[PDB]
Structure formats: C-alpha cells, structure tokens
Design a protein around this nucleic acid. Structure first.
Ligand SMILES: [K+]
Ligand SMILES: [K+]
Ligand SMILES: [K+]
Ligand SMILES: [K+]
Ligand SMILES: [K+]
Ligand SMILES: [K+]
Ligand SMILES: [K+]
Ligand SMILES: [K+]
Ligand SMILES: [K+]
Ligand SMILES: [K+]
Ligand SMILES: [K+]
Ligand SMILES: [K+]
Ligand SMILES: [K+]
Ligand SMILES: [K+]
Ligand SMILES: [K+]
Ligand SMILES: [K+]
Ligand SMILES: [K+]
Ligand SMILES: [K+]
Ligand SMILES: [K+]
Ligand SMILES: [K+]
Ligand SMILES: [K+]
Ligand SMILES: [K+]
Ligand SMILES: [K+]
Ligand SMILES: [K+]
Ligand SMILES: [K+]
Ligand SMILES: [K+]
Ligand SMILES: [K+]
Ligand SMILES: [K+]
Ligand SMILES: [K+]
Ligand SMILES: [K+]
Ligand SMILES: [Mg+2]
Ligand SMILES: [Mg+2]
Ligand SMILES: [Mg+2]
Ligand SMILES: [Mg+2]
Ligand SMILES: [Mg+2]
Ligand SMILES: [Mg+2]
Ligand SMILES: [Mg+2]
Ligand SMILES: [Mg+2]
Ligand SMILES: [Mg+2]
Ligand SMILES: [Mg+2]
Ligand SMILES: [Mg+2]
Ligand SMILES: [Mg+2]
Ligand SMILES: [Mg+2]
Ligand SMILES: [Mg+2]
Ligand SMILES: [Mg+2]
Ligand SMILES: [Mg+2]
Ligand SMILES: [Mg+2]
Ligand SMILES: [Mg+2]
Ligand SMILES: [Mg+2]
Ligand SMILES: [Mg+2]
Ligand SMILES: [Mg+2]
Ligand SMILES: [Mg+2]
Ligand SMILES: [Mg+2]
Ligand SMILES: [Mg+2]
Ligand SMILES: [Mg+2]
Lengths: 50, 107, 87, 116, 133
RNA sequence: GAACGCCCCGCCGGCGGAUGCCUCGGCCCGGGCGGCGACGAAGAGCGCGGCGGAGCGCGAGACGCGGUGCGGACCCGCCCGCCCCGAGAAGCACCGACCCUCGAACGCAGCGCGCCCGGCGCCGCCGCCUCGGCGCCC
RNA sequence: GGCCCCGGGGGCGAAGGCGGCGCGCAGGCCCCGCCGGACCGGCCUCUGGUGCAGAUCUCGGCAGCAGUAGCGCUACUCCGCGCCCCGGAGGACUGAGGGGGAGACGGGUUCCGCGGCGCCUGCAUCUGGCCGCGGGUGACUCGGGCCUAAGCGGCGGGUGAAG
RNA sequence: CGCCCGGCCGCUCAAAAGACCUGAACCCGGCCGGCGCCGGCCCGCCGGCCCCGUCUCGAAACACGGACCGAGGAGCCA
RNA sequence: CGGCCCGAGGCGGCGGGGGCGACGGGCGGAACUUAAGCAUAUCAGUACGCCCCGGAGGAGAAACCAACCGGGAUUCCCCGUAGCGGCGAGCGACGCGGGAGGAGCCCGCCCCGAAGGCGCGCUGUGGGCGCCGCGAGGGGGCCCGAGGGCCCCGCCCGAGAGGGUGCAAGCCCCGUACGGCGGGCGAGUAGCGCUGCUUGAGCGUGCAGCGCG
C-alpha cells in the first residue's frame, strides 16, 4: 500500500536488507561448501505476513 | 540410598563425639494377647520411673535419656523393670581418647 | 461459485503483528492476540498442547539476566554476599 | 594501540570531557572518508575507554556522597537476589521468648560417653 | 586402572574433548620430546612445540630437519621449512607437507623471557616429586 | 530374410543409492543442584563486524569497555597487529560498569500527544501534613 | 561372559560386492578368481526390538505406455549482419463502460541505469516482473495526527469456587 | 605441459578416491552368442505342467488383493 | 472553642503484581471404556480448566489406638482382609509386629498494670566439596605411499583406564597410579433435624447449606 504505518515499514525494511547471498570471502574464511543462504525469499512466491 | 544414609550418620557422629547416636529408651511389653510375654524398645521413660532414681525431666534429657510424659504405667512390674534399667545406665555413663557407643544402647 | 471465484474477494487483514509476542496473530477488530493472549496480564498457556508450550517458553530466548545470576551463585561470590547481609 | 585506560586515570573531568569531544568528531571524519581504515577500528574503542573512565570516576564520587546516609540510592545498594532482600536475619530467626530462653540456660549441652 | 571418578573413560566424551578443546589445551597437546642433549641440560622430557625451533623428523615419509615456520593449531599440525609437497613446475612455489608434532624431536629451542621461566617453574615442581618419592 | 522383442556365451558403459564399515548425536539409570522479577524478569522487536547473509554473542561504551589473577606465540580468507626477562597474540576464572523500543510494564496512546518546568501510574502497611460531619460532648 | 599351547585370523589385504566349484534330505555352509581398503570370528555358557511375496502395507527409486495425449482474446510481412528484441517502411487490432491515463485495498523493491544468460521465461531469445552490481520516495498549504457516527472501553462498586 | 577448436593427450596421488568411501536390485545403451519350469538324452526334439495368497461344502475362475525392485514391517514385557 | 469518635485529599519510607511440560498444596470436574445390551456401579475422587507456595511441601506433639502380664506426636519403607456392591461386573482401608528417623513447645483465660517495641497503647503493651600441579619407561633388521606389521633382543609398572598419532603402540605425545591448598482450660460453636456430595464405613466415613442450639 502507498499508505502504511512506520511500524510496518520498518519490519518490511529489514526483510529487504537481510535478503542476501553469502559473501565469497566468507566462503573462503569459514571453509564452506553449502553456499546458498536458504533464508532468502522472492517477492513472487513469498507470503511475508508483515 | 544405602550409601547415602550411612554417610549421613557418619558425619552426625563426629559432630557429637563422643555422644552416641541414640538415646536410652525404655523396655515395654508388646501390645496384644498375641505378643505379650516379650519386650521391645519403647519411646520414653515415665515420670514415676524417673522419680525412682532421682532425675527431673529436664535433668535426664541432658545426659541422653528420652522422656515421655504422656505414657502411664499399667502395673508395678513395669516400674521395677525400667528403674533397674535407669539405675544400670547411670553406672556406665561418664560426664566431661573416648569411646563412642554404636547401635542401640542396652538392646 | 463457492470455490475459486470466492477466493478472489479477499483483500483484508484479519490479524496483524502482536506487540508482546511478535507473531501474525493480533486480531485487528477484537484487539486481542490469539497466541499470547495480549492485552491480558498473564500469558496464554495450555496443557493440552505441550508442543505449543516448547515453541515459546523459558530458554528459547537469551536468558540474559538469569544466566548471570546462576553463574554468580554456583561459582562466584554471591553466597558469601548473603552471609554479610544476613547478619 | 590507542589510549590506555590507565593513562586517563589521574586526568581531570575537563581534560576527559575535552578529550571525548575530539574522538567523537574524528569518527565523523573517518565515517565520511569511508563513504566517500585501520585507524577507524582503534578510534571506536578509544571512545569507549574514555566513557568507561568518566563513569567510573563519577560512581566513586557519588558513592561517598551517600556513605553515611540512612537511605541510599538503589544502584549503590548491595548485590543480592530478590529473595535474599526479603529474608529474615539470622539474629531475627534465632530470637526466642523470654521464658523459653531462661530454660535453655538452665540445662546446657553436655558431652558424655557410654560404655558397653 | 583408573581410580578417579570425575575423569571420563568413555570414548564418545574423550573424542569430543580432543576436538572442541580450547586453545590453551591444544597447545599443551602439541608437545614433542626433547633430544638427549637438551634432556641433560634442561632436565625436562617434553616441551610444547613453537614457531622458531629446529626439529628432527622420523617415522614418516618426509624425514628431515628444519625450522618451524607455522603452527596449524586447528589441525594439530606444524609446517617445517624444507618439507614440501612434490611440486609440478620447476619454478612454482613450495607447498608445505604438514607434520604432526609427535612425529618430531626438538633439537634446539627458541628462547625468551617466558620460556626460560616456564622451564624453571617445571623443574622445581619435578624436584618436589623427587623429594616425596 | 532382416529388424523389433526375449535369453545370456561373455566383455564394457549408464541410472539409482541398497549393503558393509564408521559417529562431536540420541535414549536409559544414578548422583548433584535447586540459584528469577518494579535494583524492570521470562519473552518479543530493532540495531551493532574494515571488507558481513544465517546462527551464537553483544547494546549507540553494541561481533564489546575496564580491574585483579593466570597463560605465553599467535590472529581460519585478504589485510592489519603483536614479537624483546615483560614490552604481551590465542585462551581461562572471578569482579566493576554500559545496557535502544515493547513486555507484570508505570503520564495518556502505540509511534501520535499532554500537563508541569524536578517531574507526572495502581493497590497495601506504618507515620505525618491539611481538612469534613444537625456522630458523642463541651 | 569364556577358550582358541610361546598365545586365535588380518595392508603378504578384514567386512561387504560380482561370477564359479564343492558339501548337506534341507534350512544353509565352505573354498577359489576379480573387485574393495580396515576390521573379523569357530566351539561352550548367557541374552533378545531375532528370519517376509502378499496387509487398496510404509518410505524411497523407477518401467511399459511413448517421442504418445497434448502446446478464448481476427495478424503479421520485407529490409537493416536480424531473434518473438531494437529501427525504418507497410498491413491490422483494442475502439473513450478502452488491451488508454490514474487512485483505494493487497503485494513489498517487483521501480531506475549499466551488465548477463547458469535457473526461470511449458517453442526460441541477444528479451524480460529472471540473475549480478550500483542507485531511488524531499510538504505551513495533499493525506495521516484532531472531531464525532454505528460501536467499543473505563467507572467508588456489584456478583461468581475462580478465570 | 602440449595439440585442435569444449574434446583429446596427460599431470598430482598408493589409488582418482575428481565432487567425491564401498556402490547391490529393478530398468537401460554399445560389442559378442543364442531363439517359461520339471525329466531323459549334449541340446532341440519327445513326455508331463492352469495364478499365487485368502474366506469357503467347493477357486484357473467372469470372487477379492497383487506393474516392478530395495530397505522397514506384526504373540514382547509386567 | 477545643477533645474524642467516624471518614476525606496529599506527602515520605517500605512491600505486592509477572515467569516454569517435574515434585507439592487448594478448588471446579468429564466422557470414551467395562458390565459381552444399559440407567445404579466402573473408568476416576483421573484428563483438562482456575488459583497458591518452597527447596522441598504437606502433616504433627492425642477430645489417639486399644481390650493386652498393653502401647504412646507426624512422615516414609516392609508385611496382610474386614467390608462395600443391579451382593453383578467390579471395588477395598487399618491396628498389632519388624525397620529408617526422632524433639519438643506456645497463646487465650487468670495475677500484676505501662514496669513495654513510648506521636503507639488502658477497647491492654510488657512481665509471671572445590581450586592447583608434577608425572616413569624401545631399540636393530626386512618391508610399505606411510610401520601402531613381521623377525630378534630389552626396559617401566602405586601408572596394562583410555584418547591422539599416515596401518593393532605400557615405553612417539596427552593422560592414568602415588599429593598439596583452601577447610483455670476457646459458642451461633459441638451436636441434632431435613437435604446435596463424598467414603470400605455398612439405621452415616468425611464435608456443606438452612432451621435449631
Ligand atoms: K508507496
Ligand atoms: K507476494
Ligand atoms: K468458482
Ligand atoms: K484473538
Ligand atoms: K500415453
Ligand atoms: K540486458
Ligand atoms: K463468591
Ligand atoms: K478372503
Ligand atoms: K468374508
Ligand atoms: K459356504
Ligand atoms: K486359488
Ligand atoms: K467362473
Ligand atoms: K481370467
Ligand atoms: K470366495
Ligand atoms: K466384485
Ligand atoms: K484377482
Ligand atoms: K469429576
Ligand atoms: K465414562
Ligand atoms: K451407553
Ligand atoms: K456406559
Ligand atoms: K452398585
Ligand atoms: K459411577
Ligand atoms: K452383571
Ligand atoms: K532410631
Ligand atoms: K606419532
Ligand atoms: K452462641
Ligand atoms: K452447625
Ligand atoms: K464408596
Ligand atoms: K451394607
Ligand atoms: K431449614
Ligand atoms: Mg461452504
Ligand atoms: Mg471483520
Ligand atoms: Mg530471586
Ligand atoms: Mg548476522
Ligand atoms: Mg512505557
Ligand atoms: Mg537389541
Ligand atoms: Mg520384529
Ligand atoms: Mg517386499
Ligand atoms: Mg476495430
Ligand atoms: Mg525494469
Ligand atoms: Mg522455453
Ligand atoms: Mg488542509
Ligand atoms: Mg563412488
Ligand atoms: Mg467371514
Ligand atoms: Mg470382501
Ligand atoms: Mg488390482
Ligand atoms: Mg526386508
Ligand atoms: Mg504512597
Ligand atoms: Mg482407554
Ligand atoms: Mg457395554
Ligand atoms: Mg462389547
Ligand atoms: Mg453401546
Ligand atoms: Mg473409589
Ligand atoms: Mg512446612
Ligand atoms: Mg462413591
């Protein structure tokens, strides 16, 4: 909606910011083979209830 | 549980050395027609038994005798058997390398 | 038309975010939480669901204060501090 | 590297308030350079060393301003749990009535030995 | 046979303690025997390995001697100078073959203020035991 | 007839993940312990790393700050930094502080507003200040 | 739990796998060759979550069927190295209750620029609401904050074993 | 390392163990051989042979369950 | 106009509120199930709902049990049939006896009256286990990618519990055995009548409402 409360805006803002890949130097640093962050989401198939 | 109880009464016995772990308790008749003619250990000594030897209730409690003022004697033999028991124990008591007595006193 | 067509009439929010438990369970029209019971002063807890009890309880969070108090008692100096005070 | 906490001990309040003003302003300069590198790590914790000392000198001053008062601020009261603050004192738990006491002095505790 | 009942003799717990050890325990567990020449001089049997010592290797397929360039405490291994993986090119860099400290014998020790003192601390306790016995 | 299909006289390839061996995990019994909170708990939200998503941790002093002891060469990548008879990396234990919004949750509301220039919630106990009554009296 | 005559068999190759002889009425057992790369037992006594073809059994893999059934909204073509993308020229459509221009609710970064084709775009792709990297929403006058509607809370107290 | 424009050759290693231990069955592709069970014969002829499990007086049944393969799967304890 | 009585607003110090899948205390309280049906009965004084503590809680120093040539507060362990019941299905205590543990006291009333905790009180105060640290003893020969393997000779042992180490290790490394620090006696009561629940309690086991007392 274009008319949203600041409290809903802030919780939506955090899901946008943390929706990221693992950095590549972290993959070298921590010696990882699983490289996908499975807590990511995509707007077409998500149901963020926030 | 057997080990726990043995450990508890070892610690208690040091804390009262050289007092024994038990009070001197009286000798009473087992109660029914089925069990009379034999004796067992009672709860405490009566004031008539204590009057025999010359101790007050507060005085006898101090040197290890259990005193039960609620009990009443039923006969004259009940008194003589327990006065003799009180008289004997006062002989084998010393009041201050000393011996602590184990188990029940005068079984 | 009680099936697929009826589902296209949904553009409402029944529940929103709770201020106490954070879940999508605060009824916007009754003003009550169906998860924790807010604005009730006590927490909603039922023994007919022990799985619901383990999901949110003591220990599933930080335990920030209770952690410090226990370690001070078990191995720190707190049992000494009571003897000075309780004298 | 950077400021030692020991070497701000002995400095006056003005010399610590004035030293904190430069540290705050310097982090503005270094955040501006970052967004427009080893030093910026040490500066964040120089700020924490100073504020650590400004607070530790202020608590020792106030805790003597109240040393002999009847009512003390709750920050300066002993460290105890909620249950401990509410317990009876050992003296309060050992109090006996007058008649009960005057009977415990009569008939003291005695050590004795019995024989087989 | 063990007598102390606060000490585990369970394989699962012992293996978990070899992993997940803190860093001060891992350093002690990476010890090696002193040579006979140093055993006479210092009157000590083993020492914790360290960056800067000279070691004689046996029992392995990479026997030799060299200085300790690195300590891989996570692996419990040490990299010695001159003991490398056989390389592909004639020019390319060396690659250290990592050695377990218990396959080594120390021939000369790195010394500083702390290492002199910890030796002397350890001799005085070993003389308390030699007076009790 | 050939080919397709089927069997295997044998030699090789796929697809799939059984079997065997392995185990920082579970389960059972026993022993300890029994230690939260208006001095703001349990729980929730948001934010914090030089390059930083998740989880652990921490709170605008934020991937930590100080003090006493101990320890004595490292700090998973790229860098920084430390290096020495003390100059001090990893690690450990106790102690002192910091401690944003919501929550028993406390000026009202839940994100917007006040009264007053310290501040400003409810109940109860003990005291104290100021008071009401054609209660009993004077 | 025991034994296995200088203290049972093992990298001079354990368990398992694939073929092939033998022994036993049989359940099954033993040996050899190849594979594999670290553990395994014969006899006596003890113990049990101890033997599968089926239960419209449970979980996992997977065949024939089979290159089979199948892929509303009038429509694209020529040239540009040319893709359904972009350009120019032509031919048509939606037809002002619009396949147009904008808000409310819901969604939550899908918006923009540059790059790109591993996934997706049930055909293709150089396209893209897909993937990577940077960015982006400015109010005395617009709305929210204020007022009250239908309602909903609160109220010395009242009631109920309590909630 | 080299050669062609992903492949080949080959390097590390005891070994590719190469995205990973071992790697069974069902099912499938290439080369080579041939045209259901029991019995006799060296071998494609002759002889015999209905689909199991189940309830049932009675099942090959036009009575029901079952495409195939693996692993799990039901009289123990007080 | 003051006192006492009964109330109101404010201020200060102190206390309460919430949290837990156990154990513990107080209330409300099922049905499936069994009876080869089903109403009493059973399941069960259980599930579940509400309230309240603690490190334990509850209980407790006889308005007790008995019938003896008698015991003697409470709790817990071992041991075993009176009885209830469509007298069906089912249900069910306890004393004596053997052990663990053992501990006893107060207020009201009465006497003295402020002797007290003194802005109160004569409508009655006061007295009668965990923290530290040392820690012994094996070589030579074949072989392997690698010796913890094979052959042959030894040492330590209060230590042959065990983990690691390139393949089965007392002697390669950490540990393991042997030790030091802190250390004169209670009233709307008891009882009784009627009614509801509960119990093995049977012309009443325990509780409760109302009337009486
Ligand atoms: K918007
Ligand atoms: K969505
Ligand atoms: K429909
Ligand atoms: K609700
Ligand atoms: K088909
Ligand atoms: K593009
Ligand atoms: K009531
Ligand atoms: K059947
Ligand atoms: K049938
Ligand atoms: K029939
Ligand atoms: K049949
Ligand atoms: K038929
Ligand atoms: K048929
Ligand atoms: K049939
Ligand atoms: K049929
Ligand atoms: K059939
Ligand atoms: K009930
Ligand atoms: K029922
Ligand atoms: K019924
Ligand atoms: K019934
Ligand atoms: K009945
Ligand atoms: K019943
Ligand atoms: K019956
Ligand atoms: K006893
Ligand atoms: K070794
Ligand atoms: K009365
Ligand atoms: K009554
Ligand atoms: K009954
Ligand atoms: K009866
Ligand atoms: K009545
Ligand atoms: Mg319907
Ligand atoms: Mg509605
Ligand atoms: Mg507490
Ligand atoms: Mg994070
Ligand atoms: Mg607030
Ligand atoms: Mg088993
Ligand atoms: Mg079975
Ligand atoms: Mg099967
Ligand atoms: Mg038209
Ligand atoms: Mg776009
Ligand atoms: Mg496509
Ligand atoms: Mg306006
Ligand atoms: Mg494989
Ligand atoms: Mg039938
Ligand atoms: Mg049928
Ligand atoms: Mg079928
Ligand atoms: Mg099976
Ligand atoms: Mg107040
Ligand atoms: Mg049942
Ligand atoms: Mg029935
Ligand atoms: Mg039936
Ligand atoms: Mg029925
Ligand atoms: Mg019953
Ligand atoms: Mg109690
Ligand atoms: Mg009943």
């Amino acid at each position: 909606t274009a008319n949203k409360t600041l409290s809903r805006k802030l919780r939506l803002a955090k899901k946008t910011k943390t929706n990221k890949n693992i950095p590549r130097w972290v993959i070298a640093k921590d010696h990882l083979k699983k490289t996908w962050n499975y807590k990511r989401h995509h707007w077409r198939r998500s149901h963020l209830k926030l | 549980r057997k080990i726990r109880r043995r450990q508890t009464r070892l610690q208690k016995a040091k804390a009262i050395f050289p007092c024994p772990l038990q009070k001197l308790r009286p000798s009473v008749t087992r109660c029914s027609q089925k069990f009379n003619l034999t004796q067992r250990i009672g709860r405490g000594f009566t004031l008539r038994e204590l009057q025999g030897v010359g101790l007050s209730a507060g005085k006898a409690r101090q040197i290890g005798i259990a005193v039960d003022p609620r009990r009443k004697n039923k006969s004259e033999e009940s008194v003589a058997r327990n006065v003799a028991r009180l008289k004997e124990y006062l002989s084998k008591v010393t009041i201050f390398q000393a011996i602590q007595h184990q188990g029940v006193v005068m079984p | 038309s009680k099936g697929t067509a009826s589902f296209g009439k949904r553009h409402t929010r029944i529940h929103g975010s709770c201020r106490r438990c954070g879940k999508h369970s605060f009824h916007l029209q009754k003003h009550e939480c169906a998860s924790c019971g807010y604005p009730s002063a006590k927490m909603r807890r039922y023994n007919w669901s022990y799985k619901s009890l383990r999901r949110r309880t003591q220990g599933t969070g930080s335990m920030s204060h209770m952690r410090k108090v226990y370690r001070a008692y078990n191995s720190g100096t707190l049992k000494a501090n009571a003897r000075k005070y309780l004298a | 590297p950077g400021l030692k906490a020991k070497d701000l001990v002995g400095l006056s309040q003005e010399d610590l308030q004035r030293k904190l003003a430069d540290l705050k302003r310097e982090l503005l300069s270094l955040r501006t350079m970052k967004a427009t590198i080893a030093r910026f790590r040490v500066c964040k914790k120089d700020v924490a060393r100073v504020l650590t000392v400004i607070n530790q000198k202020a608590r020792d001053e106030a805790r003597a301003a109240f040393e002999g008062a009847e009512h003390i601020p709750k920050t300066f009261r002993p460290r105890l749990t909620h249950a401990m603050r509410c317990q009876l004192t050992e003296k309060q738990k050992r109090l006996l009535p007058s008649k009960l006491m005057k009977r415990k002095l009569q008939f003291p505790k005695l050590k004795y030995a019995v024989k087989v | 046979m063990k007598l102390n009942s606060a000490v585990t003799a369970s394989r699962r717990k012992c293996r978990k303690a070899y992993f997940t050890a803190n860093a001060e325990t891992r350093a002690k567990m990476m010890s090696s025997r002193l040579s006979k020449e140093l055993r006479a001089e210092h009157k000590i049997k083993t020492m914790p390995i360290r960056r800067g010592d000279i070691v004689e290797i046996f029992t392995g397929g990479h026997k030799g001697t060299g200085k300790v360039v690195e300590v891989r405490r996570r692996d419990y291994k040490i990299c010695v100078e001159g003991i490398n993986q056989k390389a592909r090119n004639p020019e390319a860099k060396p690659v250290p073959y990592p050695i377990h400290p218990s396959n080594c014998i120390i021939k000369e020790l790195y010394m500083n203020g702390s290492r002199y003192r910890a030796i002397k601390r350890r001799q005085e306790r070993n003389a308390e035991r030699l007076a009790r016995i």
